[PDB]
Design an enzyme around this catalytic site. Structure first.
Site, PDB file in Angstrom:
ATOM      1  CG  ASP A   1      -1.914   1.135   1.205  1.00 22.78           C
ATOM      2  OD1 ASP A   1      -1.737   2.069   0.395  1.00 22.78           O
ATOM      3  OD2 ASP A   1      -2.862   1.107   2.021  1.00 22.78           O
ATOM      4  CG  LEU A   2       2.897   2.084  -3.545  1.00 25.42           C
ATOM      5  CD1 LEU A   2       3.641   2.580  -4.774  1.00 25.42           C
ATOM      6  CD2 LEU A   2       3.828   1.262  -2.660  1.00 25.42           C
TER       7      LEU A   2
ATOM      8  CE1 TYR B   1      -3.375   8.434  -8.573  1.00 25.84           C
ATOM      9  CE2 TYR B   1      -5.016  10.076  -7.985  1.00 25.84           C
ATOM     10  CZ  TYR B   1      -4.681   8.882  -8.585  1.00 25.84           C
ATOM     11  OH  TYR B   1      -5.661   8.134  -9.194  1.00 25.84           O
TER      12      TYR B   1
ATOM     13  NE  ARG C   1      -1.187  11.308   5.985  1.00 23.79           N
ATOM     14  CZ  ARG C   1      -1.020  11.120   4.683  1.00 23.79           C
ATOM     15  NH1 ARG C   1      -1.881  10.387   4.003  1.00 23.79           N
ATOM     16  NH2 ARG C   1      -0.002  11.679   4.060  1.00 23.79           N
TER      17      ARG C   1
ATOM     18  CG  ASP D   1      -2.950   3.525  -3.862  1.00 19.19           C
ATOM     19  OD1 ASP D   1      -3.638   2.520  -3.570  1.00 19.19           O
ATOM     20  OD2 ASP D   1      -3.303   4.687  -3.582  1.00 19.19           O
ATOM     21  CD  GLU D   2      -5.036  -0.398  -1.012  1.00 18.97           C
ATOM     22  OE1 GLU D   2      -5.554  -1.506  -0.765  1.00 18.97           O
ATOM     23  OE2 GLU D   2      -5.527   0.681  -0.624  1.00 18.97           O
TER      24      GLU D   2
END
EC number: 2.7.7.7
Lengths: 367, 367
Positions: A9-10, A14, A46, A101-102
């Site tokens: 899981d990157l 993006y 974040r 991305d997974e």
DNA sequence: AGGGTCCTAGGACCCT
DNA sequence: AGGGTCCTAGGACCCT
């Protein structure tokens, strides 16, 4: 029948891709925006309160410093996505893509091979790479702990190769099925990995706060379950299988209730090449005329480039519109399989006539 | 890009199979009945006026002597059907099944091979096996006449082998695509073959009396076309492609209009093993209780025998009911893939509860 | 948003 | 009837 699965899981995919393009974007908070919505942000942003899919306004309210960046063209993300899946396919060919991305990989055949090559004295020298969920104690005579620890060693090798060869950080979760690997990959969330020993499976699923959070339980089956008084994982575990059967179906029922217990027998699928090629264009009610033909000519413009470069050829096109959505599809004529767009625009134009805020063209049924 | 296709069409297949079982049934007229409907009859019965799907009463009115025979259990027909397809697969592997008694074979690769082995002087000695449509004259320097005549020689070899090895008579039609091969296989209708040279393609399609008779043009598209004033093959040929596009679709339109001209580029598909296994039970409103479980237990009874003996396993079951029809399907649990019926009856019982003159269970999505 | 996945239940077609 | 075929348009799910 034991399985070792890794969920990769990157982090903020993006953003990672954009931060690679213009290295200056690092350090400072970064949002990737799609219309009026920051879909992805780097860690910095974040920390300042920029949340997944946050208005470009609310983003600039908790975070007036935002250095936003447009990400409506997914070409560069899509290309890196497949570079990551291919890197993992090199480790073991059976890789399942979930979004861009997974990735899931079945490490079972690979873990077993690494053990028969390993020597007796090593077995006690086996160590975990990364975190162990719930700090659980390793038992080096538990064959299942040893395999999951080898799994963690392979997971760390993948993550090192993703960084070294593609410059990408990401998380990994090692478990005995897809559900748990995906649920544990996020425990230590920035560029780290976690391994789940079976004795902590219940602790993990019960760490969830609503069956919402179980993958495979979306909004519909959620609100449905919430109408039966089911809200916590334990509720679903103890709820009547019978009422659940008759309420959601025999299909949904036992699958959902098994997920409740951490059970998930579903195999890791080889995703291989895509089963479809779509592109989307949304606008402020910008379509109400022959403009749709200027768009559609443009949507399809880039697709024909994509669906061609792939190699296979689609044998169905589709046109999608928003005003719930509607679609009208048709087989792609043989002559048109091999200049195009004169014939294809027309095809989709009559599909368009049969049927404006959204507009998309999808190439599917590939061969 | 030239193609040689054969359409093989066995005469009154069901009757043939029954007449083989009890040889006494030959000579005298024979009907095969399904409830109140003679679905198939031997030539004798057909001479007396017994028509395809004729009431067992109307049958016994033109033909009081009928020696009817029940054919609601298709097991023996289905088995012979596949024995015939396999015999043809031995000739060339690419055989498409259409129903139980019709097969298409692409003879192109095979015809070409037989020519490069043939010698110069033979080319003039090539003869047709069977009839030539419209008594058309052969031109032995037309490469397309020669290939279609070799095609007729292969067709006669198949028919001889179907008789010699399975005791079955049937018709064959040799043409340059699937449409025409199927349209010409029936010109000389009892246990004979016909070959179509291209110069008579238009004569053949124009020999039809209503676009109804073009395969690929069923009741719906028929009545639709009949609402545009299209009735004859020539009407559809000359009708506005444009109005047809907007009336039936871009898909239906050009395919139907090309069929109008005798054009049909669709390839012969390898049918291989079935994509589904279904069984049906209809009754005089005999179902309105737990009887459905006695039936369903019976429908599924024989299926599990069938779907098992095949080898592959279905990953979806379906239950169908009549009261237009309705269906409710569900994936077959992994545990149930490998005693069954305790688990399967239950599956379909809850599918039944979710939803009585018809009742069927179908096993599909095979792997 | 922009992009994917697979399923389902109805519908058209073919044959008897 | 009893039995097949493949498509389609909507719907659920996953990710950002």
């Amino acid at each position: 029948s034991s399985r070792v699965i890794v969920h990769v899981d990157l982090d903020c995919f993006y953003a990672q891709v954009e931060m690679i393009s213009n290295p200056e974007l690092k350090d400072k908070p970064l949002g990737v925006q799609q219309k009026y919505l920051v879909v992805t942000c780097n860690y910095e942003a974040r920390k300042l309160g920029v949340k997944k899919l946050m208005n470009v306004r609310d983003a600039k309210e908790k975070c007036p410093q935002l250095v936003l960046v447009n990400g409506e063209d997914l070409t560069r993300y899509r290309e890196m996505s497949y570079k990551v899946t291919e890197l993992l396919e090199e480790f073991s060919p059976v890789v399942e893509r979930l979004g861009f991305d997974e990735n899931f990989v079945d490490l079972t055949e690979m873990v077993e091979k690494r053990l028969q090559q390993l020597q007796s004295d090593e077995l006690s020298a086996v160590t975990v790479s990364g975190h162990v969920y719930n700090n659980q104690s390793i038992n080096l005579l538990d064959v299942l702990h040893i395999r999951l620890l080898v799994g963690s060693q392979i997971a760390a090798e993948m993550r090192e190769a993703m960084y070294n060869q593609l410059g990408l950080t990401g998380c990994a979760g090692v478990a005995s099925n897809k559900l748990l690997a995906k649920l544990v990959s996020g425990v230590f969330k920035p560029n780290q990995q976690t391994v789940l020993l079976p004795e902590s499976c219940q602790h993990l699923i019960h760490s969830l706060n609503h069956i919402k959070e179980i993958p495979g339980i979306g909004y519909k089956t959620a609100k449905c379950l919430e109408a039966l008084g089911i809200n916590s994982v334990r509720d679903l575990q103890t709820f009547s299988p019978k009422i659940l059967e008759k309420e959601l179906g025999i299909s949904v029922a036992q699958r959902i209730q098994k997920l409740s217990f951490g059970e998930d027998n579903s195999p890791v699928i080889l995703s291989g090449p895509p089963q479809s090629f779509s592109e989307e264009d949304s606008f402020k009610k910008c379509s109400s005329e022959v403009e749709a033909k200027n768009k559609i000519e443009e949507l399809l413009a880039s697709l024909l480039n994509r669906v061609c470069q792939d190699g296979r050829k689609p044998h169905t096109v589709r046109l999608i519109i928003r005003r719930g959505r509607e679609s009208r599809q048709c087989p792609i004529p043989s002559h048109v399989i091999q200049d195009v767009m004169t014939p294809m625009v027309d095809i989709l134009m009559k599909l368009f006539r049969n049927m404006l805020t959204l507009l998309s063209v999808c190439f599917c049924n590939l061969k």
